[PDB]
Design an enzyme around this catalytic site. Sequence first.
Site, PDB file in Angstrom:
ATOM      1  N   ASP B  28       5.951 -46.454 -24.520  1.00 47.68           N
ATOM      2  CA  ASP B  28       5.995 -47.878 -25.330  1.00 47.68           C
ATOM      3  C   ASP B  28       7.240 -48.641 -24.880  1.00 47.68           C
ATOM      4  O   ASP B  28       8.365 -48.685 -26.180  1.00 47.68           O
ATOM      5  CB  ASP B  28       5.562 -48.269 -26.818  1.00 47.68           C
ATOM      6  CG  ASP B  28       6.029 -49.832 -27.697  1.00 47.68           C
ATOM      7  OD1 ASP B  28       4.765 -50.526 -26.421  1.00 47.68           O
ATOM      8  OD2 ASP B  28       6.259 -49.612 -28.297  1.00 47.68           O
ATOM      9  N   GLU B  54       3.650 -46.973 -20.141  1.00 47.19           N
ATOM     10  CA  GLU B  54       4.609 -48.303 -20.389  1.00 47.19           C
ATOM     11  C   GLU B  54       5.876 -47.551 -20.541  1.00 47.19           C
ATOM     12  O   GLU B  54       6.639 -47.946 -21.190  1.00 47.19           O
ATOM     13  CB  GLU B  54       3.989 -48.748 -21.704  1.00 47.19           C
ATOM     14  CG  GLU B  54       2.445 -49.057 -22.109  1.00 47.19           C
ATOM     15  CD  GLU B  54       2.539 -50.126 -23.443  1.00 47.19           C
ATOM     16  OE1 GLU B  54       1.538 -49.402 -24.293  1.00 47.19           O
ATOM     17  OE2 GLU B  54       3.700 -50.480 -23.640  1.00 47.19           O
ATOM     18  N   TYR B 129      -1.627 -45.423 -16.776  1.00 45.66           N
ATOM     19  CA  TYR B 129      -1.585 -46.756 -17.534  1.00 45.66           C
ATOM     20  C   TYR B 129      -2.993 -47.139 -17.326  1.00 45.66           C
ATOM     21  O   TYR B 129      -2.924 -48.360 -16.585  1.00 45.66           O
ATOM     22  CB  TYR B 129      -0.278 -46.581 -18.128  1.00 45.66           C
ATOM     23  CG  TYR B 129      -0.430 -48.146 -19.130  1.00 45.66           C
ATOM     24  CD1 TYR B 129      -0.281 -47.656 -20.291  1.00 45.66           C
ATOM     25  CD2 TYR B 129       0.498 -49.246 -18.674  1.00 45.66           C
ATOM     26  CE1 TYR B 129      -0.446 -48.714 -21.397  1.00 45.66           C
ATOM     27  CE2 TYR B 129       0.314 -50.706 -19.662  1.00 45.66           C
ATOM     28  CZ  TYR B 129      -0.391 -50.034 -20.678  1.00 45.66           C
ATOM     29  OH  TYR B 129      -0.192 -50.859 -22.403  1.00 45.66           O
ATOM     30  N   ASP B 168      -3.056 -43.128 -20.822  1.00 48.10           N
ATOM     31  CA  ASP B 168      -3.455 -43.575 -21.603  1.00 48.10           C
ATOM     32  C   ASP B 168      -3.856 -43.857 -20.428  1.00 48.10           C
ATOM     33  O   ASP B 168      -3.976 -44.925 -20.413  1.00 48.10           O
ATOM     34  CB  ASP B 168      -2.158 -44.285 -22.416  1.00 48.10           C
ATOM     35  CG  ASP B 168      -3.137 -45.937 -22.652  1.00 48.10           C
ATOM     36  OD1 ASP B 168      -3.893 -45.396 -23.751  1.00 48.10           O
ATOM     37  OD2 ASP B 168      -1.635 -46.436 -23.473  1.00 48.10           O
ATOM     38  N   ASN B 170      -7.282 -45.629 -22.796  1.00 51.68           N
ATOM     39  CA  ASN B 170      -6.656 -47.588 -23.460  1.00 51.68           C
ATOM     40  C   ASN B 170      -8.537 -47.134 -23.843  1.00 51.68           C
ATOM     41  O   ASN B 170      -8.831 -48.208 -23.674  1.00 51.68           O
ATOM     42  CB  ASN B 170      -6.674 -48.410 -22.832  1.00 51.68           C
ATOM     43  CG  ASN B 170      -6.100 -49.126 -23.264  1.00 51.68           C
ATOM     44  OD1 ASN B 170      -6.704 -50.735 -23.219  1.00 51.68           O
ATOM     45  ND2 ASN B 170      -5.421 -49.358 -24.659  1.00 51.68           N
ATOM     46  N   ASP B 241      -5.604 -41.304 -26.004  1.00 50.27           N
ATOM     47  CA  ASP B 241      -4.885 -40.533 -24.669  1.00 50.27           C
ATOM     48  C   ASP B 241      -5.655 -39.132 -24.502  1.00 50.27           C
ATOM     49  O   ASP B 241      -5.475 -38.436 -25.431  1.00 50.27           O
ATOM     50  CB  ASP B 241      -3.148 -40.726 -25.109  1.00 50.27           C
ATOM     51  CG  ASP B 241      -2.557 -42.174 -25.754  1.00 50.27           C
ATOM     52  OD1 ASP B 241      -1.882 -42.451 -24.428  1.00 50.27           O
ATOM     53  OD2 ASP B 241      -2.319 -42.257 -26.965  1.00 50.27           O
ATOM     54  N   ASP B 266       4.036 -46.438 -30.415  1.00 50.71           N
ATOM     55  CA  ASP B 266       3.013 -46.129 -31.043  1.00 50.71           C
ATOM     56  C   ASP B 266       1.848 -45.447 -30.783  1.00 50.71           C
ATOM     57  O   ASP B 266       0.594 -45.171 -31.176  1.00 50.71           O
ATOM     58  CB  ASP B 266       2.545 -47.644 -31.561  1.00 50.71           C
ATOM     59  CG  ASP B 266       3.186 -48.585 -30.121  1.00 50.71           C
ATOM     60  OD1 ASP B 266       3.103 -47.883 -29.581  1.00 50.71           O
ATOM     61  OD2 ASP B 266       1.954 -49.265 -29.819  1.00 50.71           O
ATOM     62  N   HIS B 267       2.365 -44.317 -28.989  1.00 53.58           N
ATOM     63  CA  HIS B 267       1.066 -43.719 -29.264  1.00 53.58           C
ATOM     64  C   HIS B 267       2.073 -42.035 -29.413  1.00 53.58           C
ATOM     65  O   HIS B 267       3.252 -41.839 -29.319  1.00 53.58           O
ATOM     66  CB  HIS B 267       1.114 -43.247 -27.562  1.00 53.58           C
ATOM     67  CG  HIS B 267      -0.028 -44.874 -27.173  1.00 53.58           C
ATOM     68  ND1 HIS B 267      -0.484 -44.334 -26.561  1.00 53.58           N
ATOM     69  CD2 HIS B 267       0.085 -45.890 -27.715  1.00 53.58           C
ATOM     70  CE1 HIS B 267      -1.552 -45.657 -26.562  1.00 53.58           C
ATOM     71  NE2 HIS B 267      -0.649 -46.590 -26.676  1.00 53.58           N
TER      72      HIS B 267
HETATM   73 MG   LIG Z   1       1.095 -50.402 -26.617  1.00 52.56          MG
END
Ligand SMILES: [Mg+2]
Lengths: 267, 276
Positions: B28, B54, B129, B168, B170, B241, B266-267
Amino acid sequence: ALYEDPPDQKTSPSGKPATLKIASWNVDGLRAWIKKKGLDWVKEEAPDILCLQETKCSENKLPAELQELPGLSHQYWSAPSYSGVGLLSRQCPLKVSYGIGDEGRVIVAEFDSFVLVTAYVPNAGRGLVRLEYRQRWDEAFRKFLKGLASRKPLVLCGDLNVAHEEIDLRNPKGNKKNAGFTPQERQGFGELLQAVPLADSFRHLYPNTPYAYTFWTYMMNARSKNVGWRLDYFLLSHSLLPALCDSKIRSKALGSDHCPITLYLAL
Amino acid sequence: ALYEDPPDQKTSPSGKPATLKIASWNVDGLRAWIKKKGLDWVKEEAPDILCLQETKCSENKLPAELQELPGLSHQYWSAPSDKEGYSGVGLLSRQCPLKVSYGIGDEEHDQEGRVIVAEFDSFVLVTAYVPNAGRGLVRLEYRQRWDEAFRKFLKGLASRKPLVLCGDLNVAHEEIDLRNPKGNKKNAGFTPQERQGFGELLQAVPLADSFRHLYPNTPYAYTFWTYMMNARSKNVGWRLDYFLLSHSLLPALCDSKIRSKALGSDHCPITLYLAL
DNA sequence: CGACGGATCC
DNA sequence: GCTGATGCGC
DNA sequence: GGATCCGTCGGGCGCATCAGC
Ligand SMILES: [Mg+2]
Ligand SMILES: [Cl-]
């Protein structure tokens, strides 16, 4: 007659070490050049950036060996829709575009401190049959480069298909009406330097050095006689001249009727 | 309920010792993450391969400390072209990969900085990503189309080599993969379209969810928590992830970890142990 | 996107 | 150059 | 009527750009 390029100066006038190595090569048949061990020279030269011109190779037919350069892992190609160019970069470019905004001859890579252009300038052809197309291309190219450099320092490399002055080719008197030494092409190169503005990196450092060529016709054993032309250039914004460490002609690297050229910049 | 990742299983089910450690981290914002000491976690984890998502950072702006990583000297970075500040993936390897490539087919014109393919001797590593479907799902359809292009891309990898897909992706595949499955079925990361797209990725390629294969019934195991509302402290999170393996690799699978305690994004990081 | 408030379920 | 506002996406 | 369902809403983060100075 014969020429030896001086060793590489990897330090700027003000003493800064070269941080950037750009090689440009008209490989005149990417596939053939691969088979002739062109990538071996790339792996050895280990440039941060490699520009290839006259690849003559559709994207879908690009050899698999090219995927084996993790040191030049960012690869961008422009196919002609007798040309084709590639740009291979160690670092991820900020942005890469194709053409001159207006045939597979130009790639534009943006980096942090400068914009890199590689160009395969159209040959005026035997009998000057495409001289006029070349004259239009030159002006359009000049125009295009002016705007780029009015936003960021510029490095222009590739096969510009013109020997600027008589010192830039072996037989000026016999070529004043051939492709690459016509007054029109010479004028265009002079206009390009003046109007952008740009400096001939090699000539800036070796103003008095004769017999330094980058191209020799396959025929008549021209290369072993150093009967040739300096057609491949690194042209630079004046603002980058303080960073100019060296501009090389790699006379002895084989694999094409052009040899490679190498730029060193302290960036 | 809070979650405590089981201890690291470093030997395969058959007794074979792990030889490859892969970490994956959506950081992030790579420059932020380094200033919150993310690199301290990387040095502690000492992975063989580090994939980052990210990065939000073009290569010219990578902090110098990223050169101060001698065990991960082969570094490959990809940032989006028009949208720098977003996306950005990185792959960092102890050993030099045989081939590196970017994107899923036309990066030289897309230039999306979401996908890095690195072929090593025994496998092909993809880090991704995956494009977010957005608030209000406004980019969900692009995400469905991307998923299909990515599926076909991963399918059409011209190697007989087994595949490791990490990063990620997502999407929380199943209801067990997030704390609030019901209230999130219309939120990005947990639509039927993304879940089915994940399911089709596993079936198409084909691939197995490493963590879920080992921990099929373990709940509350997440890799992402919104910064908002102290969700992480409450462990209200999602599993976004993954390490996805070709079926050939499962007997080489020793463990798939969620590094829940590692802060800086935040991951949290995930880690794969493979016995190769 | 988790918290929140309001509606629905038996 | 530097801060902090705004914008945008996550 | 506690549980559950469902739609709305405020907002933490990082980074680019911009205004101001
Ligand atoms: Mg993010
Ligand atoms: Cl890179």
